[PDB]
From Swiss-Prot:
Subunit structure: Interacts (via cytoplasmic domain) with feh-1 (via PID 2 domain).
Subcellular location(s) per record: Membrane; Early endosome
Species of origin: Caenorhabditis elegans
Glycan-modified residues: 10, 178
Protein's UniProt name: Amyloid-beta-like protein
All residue ranges annotated as the E2 domain in the record: 1-201
Amino acid sequence: SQDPYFKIANWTNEHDDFKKAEMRMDEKHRKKVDKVMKEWGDLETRYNEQKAKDPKGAEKFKSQMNARFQKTVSSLEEEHKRMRKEIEAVHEERVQAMLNEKKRDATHDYRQALATHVNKPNKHSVLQSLKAYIRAEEKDRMHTLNRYRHLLKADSKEAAAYKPTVIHRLRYIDLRINGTLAMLRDFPDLEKYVRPIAVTYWKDYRDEVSPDISVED
């Protein structure tokens, strides 16, 4: 069989299921490395023994066994890398889907909040609705940046083939958020009191979730 992680369907707790699958994977990998490193140990002790006894036969043994070991290592390193990517592509796919959903639904509650306002003062609801939409888009930003961060340390390369993409996502998030704020322009009554609140919230919310950093670049 495969891991139960790949056929889940609520995705509501993707962070946890993933974090957990990753440990099961990470640990299974550690089990194998240990087994090999132990094999290396028994193999190596044997070389130390036959060193002086069969110097000739012994040395051939060392050369041979390195080849094996070198190869076995690489073999493992590849697999863990192959399996790691598969689990990430999936994860990133769910997370993006989950994030979009929130955007989708945060928007609905928003527009309704507005339509309901045309008639009677949905005042507060409009705002709580907007802030939700903002949180949503900003969560998207945070994750994207973070992905660029991990990739910058994992593969300095993969990161470069992502930068153009990151700058493109971050641009449209701003655009969508501004566009969404523009929707208030028609409710003058409301754009005067809700806007300055949502805008600060946006600056405040971004400051908390995805700051700046000074350590390195």
